[PDB]
Structure formats: C-alpha cells, structure tokens
Design a protein around this ligand. Structure first.
Ligand SMILES: *SC[C@H](NC(=O)CC[C@H](N)C(=O)O)C(=O)NCC(=O)O
Ligand SMILES: *SC[C@H](NC(=O)CC[C@H](N)C(=O)O)C(=O)NCC(=O)O
Ligand SMILES: *SC[C@H](NC(=O)CC[C@H](N)C(=O)O)C(=O)NCC(=O)O
Ligand SMILES: *SC[C@H](NC(=O)CC[C@H](N)C(=O)O)C(=O)NCC(=O)O
Ligand SMILES: *SC[C@H](NC(=O)CC[C@H](N)C(=O)O)C(=O)NCC(=O)O
Ligand SMILES: N[C@@H](CCC(=O)N[C@@H](CS)C(=O)NCC(=O)O)C(=O)O
Lengths: 440, 445, 445
C-alpha cells in the first residue's frame, strides 16, 4: 500500500494530494501533528521533522521525503508515467526551471506574513510576484497554466500557496497576492476549478488560521482570533455608522483603534484610502466605506430587525434615496465645519430639506425614525452627523441652529441619541465640542 | 397604460443605464421623451426639481436618480436583485465599484470641456488606469466586472464607454481605452448584448450629443460633426487628400494647422505631429496622406474611382506606381531639403521607374497614369511634380528632371491644368517663395 | 490567369505570398531561386531589384509583379472573396493599411539586432519597436489574437513569417526573446502558427537559425557551432564540470564557448541574465539554464552511453532525485565554507555528507563505488566536481580537517570518479584547483 503522512493544514502536503488525484493513485492518509503537536515517533521516521513523508510497501517498508520528490514519485507511478513533468525535453526543462524558482516566491510570502506591516517585506513580495509573472509570460502563449491548457507540475508546486495566501495576506497584511501578478491569478483561478484542487483545498477561514503561527503577536488583527475586524476611531462619525449597525444587528467585531492625524504609517496597507472604517472578514476579504460596511453588516447579520428592507423594491428605493440624500447632507455639514463656505451651508440646508420632506411622508409608518419605530440604514447613515450638528450648533455658528428649521430631522436626532445602541457608540456632546475646539 | 412610465432623453447615458436594466430584467415601460437644457419643459421640472432625466413613475409616485431607478427595476423583476450580486461579498464589490464610477465620468466630462488640456488628459489617463486596476482586482477571466456575469457594475459604466469612444477621439484625439485594456474588453462584450446594442446611439449621435460640453473655439467645431481634415495650404502631402476630395466631391471641413512650429495641441490630434490627418463622423482617425486618399476613395459616391476595384491586375498597377511614387517623394524632398547626390540619384531612379510604367500605358490613352483622368497614382505624385516644377531649374543649379522624363512631364502638365489642381495648389511663384523662406531659415544658425 | 512564383524557401517575404496563396486557395507553379552569391543572371533579368519574390502572370502575355505585399494583395484580389484579407470595411482596411506601413520598421530593428547581436543599443531599439508593435495591436484589438481579433488578415500575414524565424534565431544568436516586450504579438504568432497556411509553409526552428546566419557577424561567439548545441562554459567552474561530464558520458557534442569570469564580458548577461556559466543553447533555439538541469536535458536527448536518469522506474528515479537534492545541500555548504568560512557552513557540509553517505550504504544501484553502482549516474555527476574541490581544499586549507576521513563511501565515490576517462577529460589538476582557491582568497584581499 502507499501511506502518506500529512497535515490538512500544510500546503506542501496539498501538492502531493493534488498529484495523487490527478494520477488516480490511491494512498492511506495518516494525520500527523505539527510544531509542538509533532510526535516523537514521527521524528524518527523523518528526522527533518516536516510533512509530508511517503511510506512505500507493507513488508519491507521504505520512506520517501520532500513534497516535490514524492509528487514526482506519484507522477512516475500513474499513467502516463511522468506526464506532469512534461512531454518533451524542452517542456520538461521549462517546468524544472520554474520549479527551481517557486521557493523564493514562498520565502517572500512567508516573510511578509512574519512581518506583515513592513514596507520592505511588502516590496519584496511585489517584486517576487512580478518575477513569477514574468516566468509565466515567458513560457505562455494563452494560459491559463504554465504550459497553457496543460496542467503540469509547475502549477501543482505553486497552487497550494496561492490558495492559502489569497485570504491570508489580505487578512494579515491588507495585501492582494495577485496585484503584481495577473497571470498568476488566472493560473490560480483555473487550478481552483479542478476537482483535484477544490476537493483538497481548505476553507478561506482555515487558510487564515493555518498561517496564524507565522504572524507576530502584536499585529493589529490578532486579538480577533480570525473574526471580523473593524479598523476604527472613537471620534469618527463614519465609523459610528458601522458600530451603530453592529450594535443594532448584534454583530460581533474586533475593534482596532487607529489614531488619526497622524495615522500610523502602516494603516495605508490596510486601506489605501487611509480612512476608517474598514472591515475585514473571516474569509479574508476587505469591506470598505462606512455605509457599504453598514450594508454588508446588514446582509450577513442573523439577529435583529433588517436595516435594509429586502423583498420590497419600493421600500428599498426609499432607504436608497434617504441614504443618498444623507451623503449630500454629510458633504455639506463636514465642509461647513472645516472650511466654513457659504456654498457649504446652502448645500447642508438643501439636503436637510430633502431628508425632512421624505421624513414627512412616513413610508415606514409612525414614529420618530426614518425607519418608523426603529432605526433602519437611513437612520444609521445620518445619525452620527446629526450628533455632530448638535455639537457644532449653535455654539460655533454665531447663532444658526439647523434643528430649529427641520423638526422631523430633530425628532430623529433626539430619539436616536436616546437609544441604548447610540449611547454605547457615541462620545458625550462635550467631547465632540472639545474636538471641534482642538481642530480650529 | 403600463405600471411603469420612464422619463428619458435618447441623448442621455444616465437614461441608457435604466433602459439597459429594463431589457435585462424584461420589464416593460411607457417611454416619455423630455427635452434637455433650454428645451426642458416646466411640467417636467415640476415632476423632478433636480431637473435631470431619468425619472421613474410607478402607478402615483416618482423615483429619482438612474442608479436608484436601475436598482428598483432589478428589485422588481425575477430574479429580484440579481444585478446587484449573488452574495454579500460579491454585492459589496459591485457597490464599491459603483461608488467609483462618478469620478471616471467626471474625468471624462472634464476632458470634453477642455479637450486639448494636458492636465485633463493626464487626469483621464489616471482615472481610466484606476478603473482598470479595480477590474483587475475583482476579475479572473473577464470580460465583465464579475467575469461572465453582467451586473450593475457594468451597466453603470457601459453607456459612458459607448459614447466616449467616438466622442473623445473626435473632440480630443484621445483613445478612451489607451490606459484601460480590461475596460475595452468589458465594453466590447457589452456592446454585443441585446440590452445594450438596441438602446445605443450611433457613433455620430454620440458626437453630437456631447457637443454642448465642448468649447466653441475647439478646432473641429466648425465641421458640425462632419469629416475634418487637419491641413496646411502649402504641404504637398495635404494636397493629395485635398485633390482626392475634389476629384471625388468628398466634403471635408478644412482646419488650417500652421507648421514650423506646429501648435503644441496638434500632437494630441496626430501623435506623429504631421498633416494631413482625417477625422470621420463616426469618430475614427485616418492617418497618413496616401492612406487618406485611399480611404476617401473607398467611401465616396461621386466621380471616377481612384483605385480600379474589381480588377486585380489593374489594382497591382496602381499599387506599384504608388510605391514607386513613394521613392520619388523621398528622393525629391531629401534633395530639396539637404542636397546630396545620393538623393539626386534616388530621384532619377524613381522617376525612371514611373516613366517605364507610363510607357506601358496600362490605363489606355491619355497623359495621366490613369489615362484620360487621374487615379490614385496621379494623385500621389502630382503635388511632388509641382514642387519639382517650382524647384527646377531655378534652385537646382540648372538641372531639370522634366527635360529627361517626357511622359512624367506630360503627367505634371496635364495635372496642373485640371480644375482640381487649380482649386488645390498654390501658384508656382508662391511655391518658389516657400522654397526661398525655407532656405533662409536653414541658414539661421 | 496562370501563375508562377519565384521564391526561396529561406525567405520570409516569399513566405508571406505563400501564406496568402493557401488562405485564398490560389494555385501556382513554384520556381526556386538562389540568393545572394547564388542568385543567377536570368532571374536578375526578370527582376532588376534582385530580390525574391516575383510573380509571373499568364503564359501568353508574360507580365511580372514585384514586391511581396503587392504580390500578396494581387493573390487576395483574385480569389473569392476578393480583397477580404485587406478588411471588410473602409475603416478596418485603413487600420490594416496603417499597420502594414509600420511592419518594415520592426523588421529593420530585428535584422539590425541579428547584424550586431550583443549590442545593448540594438537590443534597446528592438525592445522599443516590439513594444510599439504591441501598442498598435492593443489599440486595434478587443480580444485578439489577431490584429483584427478573430479575423486573420493581411496585417498578420505581413508579420507572421518574421515572428516564426525570429523566435529561434534571436534566442540562438542574441539570447533575446522576441516577445519579451510584446505579449500580444506572441498570442498573434501562436495563433497564426496553428493555421494550416502557416504551419505547412514554415521552416523548422533549425532552418530559421541557418537561414539568418548570413546576417550575423563572424566573430559572434556561437558561430563556430554551425547551428549545433552551444555551451557557455569556464574551464575552472565546478557547475560547468557537471554539464561537461554529462556530455562526455553521453557522447553529446557541444560547441564550448569559454567565458572569462571575475570579470565576465558585458555581453554575457544577454546570454544568461543570471550572469552565470554554464548555459546551454540548442539547435532549435531554446536556452537550457542551470547546471544540473542542463545535465538532465542532456540525458533526455542523448542517444549513446548509459542513461544518467533511470527512466521507467519510479523508485529509482526517487533515489537519484533525493541524492541530487542532497548533493545540492553539500555544494551549498562546501562553497559557503570555502568562500567565506564559518562554522554554520561546515555543519551544513557535514550534515549533507551524511545524507549522501547513508544513501550510498543502501547501495540502491547495486555493487560498485559510484552512486550509480558500476558506473556514474546523474547523482555522481552532480557531486563529483565538488568532491574534487573538496579534495583540493582539504586538509591544506581546512587546518587538518579532512571530510573524506569521516565518510568513506563518499571518498570511494570521489576516487573512482576521478579515475574515469570522462573525469580526466574534464577536470583541471588538483594543483590547479589549489591555485584557483589561493587566487580567490588573494582576490578577496
Ligand atoms: S506545512 C508544515 C511544514 N511543511 C514543510 O515545511 C514541508 C517542506 C519540505 N521541504 C517539503 O516536503 O517540500 C512542516 O512540517 N514544518 C514543521 C512543523 O513542525 O510544522
Ligand atoms: S472621521 C475620520 C476620517 N474618515 C473618513 O473620512 C471616512 C470617509 C469614507 N468616505 C467613509 O468611510 O465613508 C478619516 O479616516 N480621515 C483620515 C484622513 O487622513 O483623511
Ligand atoms: S508638408 C508638412 C508635413 N507633412 C508630412 O510630412 C506628412 C507625411 C506623412 N507620412 C503622410 O501623410 O504621408 C508635416 O506635417 N511636417 C511637420 C513635421 O514636424 O514634420
Ligand atoms: S528573403 C530574400 C530577400 N527578399 C526580399 O528582401 C524581398 C524584399 C521586397 N521589397 C519584398 O518583396 O518585400 C532577397 O531576395 N534578398 C536578396 C537576396 O539575394 O537574397
Ligand atoms: S563556477 C562559476 C559560477 N557558476 C554558478 O554560480 C552556477 C550556479 C547555478 N546554480 C548553476 O548553474 O548550477 C558563476 O558563473 N558565478 C558568477 C556569479 O555571478 O555568481
Ligand atoms: N445623477 C443623475 C444624472 C442624470 C443627468 O445628468 N441627466 C442629464 C442628461 S445627460 C440631464 O437631464 N441634464 C440636464 C439637462 O439635460 O438639461 C442620474 O444618474 O440619473
């Protein structure tokens, strides 16, 4: 029989598991723990103390080491014998030469994981990804594999790492593994559809977890234990929306406090727009922009009243229109606070009127909120900025108070501020006024 | 009447968005035309105080904004919401992409409002590049934002790509896709979809419908969307295009581009920085003098054919004469601009090749290469025979090529006496002055 | 009319006419004509330009057509559908015609580089024109692979014959990948090369290299190979020793190009961008890089001597694989210890020596002193040269430490290796290697 000793967490093992299926070679799987859980008896079988190892023959049992030599043994043992290593001496040489480069790519990716907010380690990953894309382009005509439509050993050697790095590098370093390597992305995309790859691949959450051991303990997302991570600030009204959504939909997230002006030199790797909020998912995806984060939170959250009224197109319109108009209110309010323009005040008034008039139709029934008795995405969109308006006016506008001219919007503001969700999110009005005084 | 009434202009990419979604989702509506700008009626301004189209009317109540209207239609036709994505993750990607389309549109209209601005051009390069990176970050195979799946992300943008491809070329000499190959593939695929094909304006309407943005002084504005020839009254290469135009009654708006130096803006219209250049009503560029002659001869409907189509051997004949004309031109201009026996011998050889072919009379009787009238060969050479007549013998230290090549002299003479020649060429003395100015400029240091 | 084409099978310009002929399904009588010093006077009579091709049309009224592109268009114009290879519209045709007008520049850059293959400046000029041709394709394409996407047209025909020959020839003569700056041109070639019209008229890779030899300078370093295998080499390099052992053992002929080192010539980076010897170039114009991968290539294509890799036996291929990997670690330790000292490197060397020794003691290839038993295999070849270096280095430069006193089977392998005729024809004397180590330490300071 063939006995393969592996961890389901190990990309080197995955190489061998892919080849086995590609070649229709059967084997008995033996689970073997890694690092502290690696047993002594296994170290006696393989003194290099790594997985995989292959054991051949029942009676006179011998061992084979190293994933690429084992992969090659399996390829040489199923028909056509050796096909995965190429069909000509020229093609085989190009597969061999490629294989002799994959280790630098791996080393660069693991190096980034070990220091994920290093600029210098980020540039090394860029350069190595680009380098590999150049090797693909030099060998390819059409793609998607290294030898075009033929899946070979070149692809097997690399794919297990592409699978795990895509979510892992986004989650731990805000890095897109493919940003400098479009050809490598098309190679990964086609490889991931092959039964041999998809039936042996771990989940995105598993790829993040299985790489946790490389990442430094002080990296900002580590306290999340693989959960949703919200990059945040206690004073930012845009973040407030996300945290309101989260409180309203009982949506657990790990809060990372990012200071602002100055923000840390690394935050630009998490969001290239250098703004909070930013949400990262347990699948290693980035969800950017406060109201987009709110809408995301509302799609996947299980507990609560819906913030977006799915199933009703007209009601979805109302919420969409209020949120758009809330955007125009925000732009007007924030400009007017910071630079004090007259064009700014007029745009604030216009947008308030758009909000107020739709509030006056009560499309979500009676009650003080745009959502009626309860807050919807509309309410979440506007409330933090009404709170900012309450702090700014009339102290810092020589007497002008927007809320004297817009009673329904003042109702929504007072009723929002008085909810439990609001009081677990917002600073005190004085803290907001003080922030304005520091700013000017 | 129907449940849905849509207020639109056929000139409007924002309406095109909603019209695409209607057909994708197979949702029917009554169309109501609304005039734009000065023509917008008050009854419509009362319906939508933002004073833009589209607006949707349901039942009654109104719904504003193309992206909100598009989403209503997506949320009203099975399968409900499908254009906005099949998962939270995919829907987020679409929504983030939709939040960036505004800036692309703004960079595009920025360029149309100031089409020869380097600064607005750089900004369009950067926003196109940026859109392509967004596409690269979400795509694997393409062609759409979500690969094989057409979604709202494509719908938002497609109407602008359709109109900007011909508009940015015509008004700016700018290729909308030069920094955005993925965006090109997305456009190309979308254009073949039923929903987009059947609701698209023609290339000429695209150009017309953006004219209102373009400065009045922009150099191509007097063409009123017709053919535009970037020209100069003294350039023999331009004379070919204009002779061809006269011979085929092909209407073109002439734009006089001064030379030595040419205006800085001209390199935007032809990156080779040369005249002539022809722009078409469909917003395409046609570069190089003899290529332009050829193009004019393909699309023109009046006059005798410059290229003898339907007869392979005679088409060879013209091609051969035109190639040889090319060597004559190289020789002559090189000898006029710099002297040199190398260039003089080139001229003589080329003249000889042309003379030997005229001697075979493949187009029958007459003084022209084309017999009784001028063909593409005659058009290619004549302006250069005219420059030779001005240059020789006064500035060639006595040498007169026409004394040694009589059929080519025949061609020049008969060419110069046609009405087309007399409507195109300057006087022989004007060409002599041109030559004298050039020579003095060359002695300036 | 009845057709006769004068061609050479070596000439890409004739190739163009031959491709169209097949695309259009036009028949012709082929007449071979010699080139250069072989061109006969009777053909020089027919075409005073003294170039191939020429087309003779008709048996009664013999007339001659010149120039591959004019001849190509003539065949396009007399086969149904008439003129389709020049495009289905005025617009597409214009794009085809403009592209045709740039091909000559690309040919010139490519021939200019063959004429001076190790020139940085000719190589840059080739990079830039290859990049320019790719931008033209980008500008006209939506999906590729041809200039007009799925339609094969005259733009492709004009360029394909050159790509076919230049791929092998530029690699063989210049170490240059014709497509490195032109990925779209590559897809265009790879698609055209599957068409019957192109596949059945293309010469072999070897013929492409021979047919271009006449352009390449006599002093270019691969010229003595007369198209054969070329090994860039150095008489003192143990990585090169691997390739030369494989060669000797498999009776594998190669033209040795001695490349000096420390400093290597400034052109060597063009042959191998890693700046290292050995590098192997094949008759088909492929580069084979890295010493042990060269040993493996050699062992695949050779037909004489015993196999170095035991193909057909998975388990035995594993043993050789594992030994070569472990030799890899030994080389790493040895070289690092010699060059820059250090106890880390000495421990690596020892460990690796033990991996090798333990595999030897199982004698997986049976009785005898070599890892391959009675004869050397890929394993012995990977390691012998570095055993020789080990013998030169120790104990003289290692303060008395002699690795071979601790690993007797490895010592046996070394001794028996060194006594082979193959090793005697490859290696320098031990004394020479000792000076080479001394020279390196003196060069260090
Ligand atoms: S995935 C966990 C590790 N695998 C390897 O490092 C295998 C690398 C070999 N070079 C190969 O076979 O190619 C591993 O087992 N590391 C040690 C541990 O204890 O986890
Ligand atoms: S409140 C702090 C700032 N946040 C934003 O501007 C978020 C705006 C986005 N449009 C959104 O998430 O909705 C901030 O992070 N400022 C940092 C800076 O340097 O600009
Ligand atoms: S006569 C003015 C010049 N025109 C051309 O040389 C056109 C040549 C093209 N190859 C063609 O249309 O055939 C000109 O534009 N000179 C400007 C300059 O900077 O060279
Ligand atoms: S491939 C051999 C040469 N052919 C050409 O250079 C043709 C050039 C024409 N302008 C064309 O048809 O495109 C050739 O005949 N060179 C001279 C020789 O004796 O080989
Ligand atoms: S012995 C001369 C050196 N050869 C190599 O380093 C080849 C090593 C490769 N891995 C191989 O071919 O096996 C050499 O050329 N050194 C020069 C340098 O730039 O490093
Ligand atoms: N944001 C609006 C924009 C609509 C718009 O700008 N429509 C234009 C037509 S191109 C318009 O009605 N312009 C005013 C006018 O034509 O007078 C939407 O997306 O629906």
């Amino acid at each position: 029989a063939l006995k393969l000793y592996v961890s389901a967490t190990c990309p080197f093992c995955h190489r061998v598991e892919i080849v086995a299926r590609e070649k229709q070679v059967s084997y008995d799987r033996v689970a073997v723990g890694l690092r502290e859980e690696m047993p002594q008896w296994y170290k006696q079988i393989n003194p290099r103390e790594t997985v995989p190892t292959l054991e051949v023959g029942n009676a006179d049992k011998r061992f084979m080491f190293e994933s690429m030599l084992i992969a090659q043994y399996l390829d040489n043992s199923g028909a056509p014998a050796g096909a995965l290593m190429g069909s000509s001496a020229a093609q085989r040489h190009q597969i061999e030469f490629f294989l002799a480069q994959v280790g630098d790519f791996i080393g660069a990716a693991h190096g980034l994981l070990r220091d994920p907010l290093s600029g210098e380690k980020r540039k090394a990953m860029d350069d190595n990804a680009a380098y590999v894309d150049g090797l693909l382009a030099a060998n390819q005509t059409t793609g998607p594999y290294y030898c075009d439509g033929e899946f070979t050993m070149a692809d097997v050697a690399l794919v297990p790492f592409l699978v795990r790095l895509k979510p892992a590098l986004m989650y731990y370093a805000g890095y897109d593994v493919f940003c400098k390597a479009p050809r490598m992305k098309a190679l990964w995309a086609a490889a991931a559809q092959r039964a041999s790859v998809r039936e042996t691949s771990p989940t995105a959450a598993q790829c993040i977890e299985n790489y946790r051991h490389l990442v430094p303990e002080s990296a900002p997302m580590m306290g999340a234990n693989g959960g949703h991570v919200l990059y945040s600030n206690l004073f930012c009204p845009f973040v407030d929306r996300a945290r309101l959504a989260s409180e309203l939909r009982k949506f657990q997230m790990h809060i990372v406090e990012v200071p602002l002006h100055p923000q840390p030199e690394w935050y630009k790797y998490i969001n290239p727009r250098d703004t909070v909020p930013a949400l990262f998912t347990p699948s290693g995806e980035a969800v950017h922009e406060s109201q987009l984060i709110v809408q995301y939170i509302d799609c996947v959250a299980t507990k609560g009243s819906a913030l977006v009224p799915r199933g009703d197109a007209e009601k979805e319109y109302e919420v969409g229109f209020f949120v758009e108009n809330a955007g125009y209110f925000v732009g007007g309010l924030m400009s007017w606070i910071i630079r004090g323009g007259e064009d700014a005040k007029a745009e604030l008034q216009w947008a308030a009127g758009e909000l107020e008039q739709q509030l006056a139709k009560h499309p979500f029934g009676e009650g003080p909120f745009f959502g009626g008795k309860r807050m919807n995405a509309g309410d979440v969109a506007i409330l933090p900025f009404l709170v900012r308006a309450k702090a700014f006016m009339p102290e810092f506008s020589g007497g002008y108070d927007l809320f004297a001219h817009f009673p329904l919007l003042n109702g929504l503001a007072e009723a929002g501020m008085a909810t439990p969700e609001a009081k677990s999110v917002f600073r005190t009005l004085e803290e907001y006024k003080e922030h304005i005084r520091k700013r000017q």
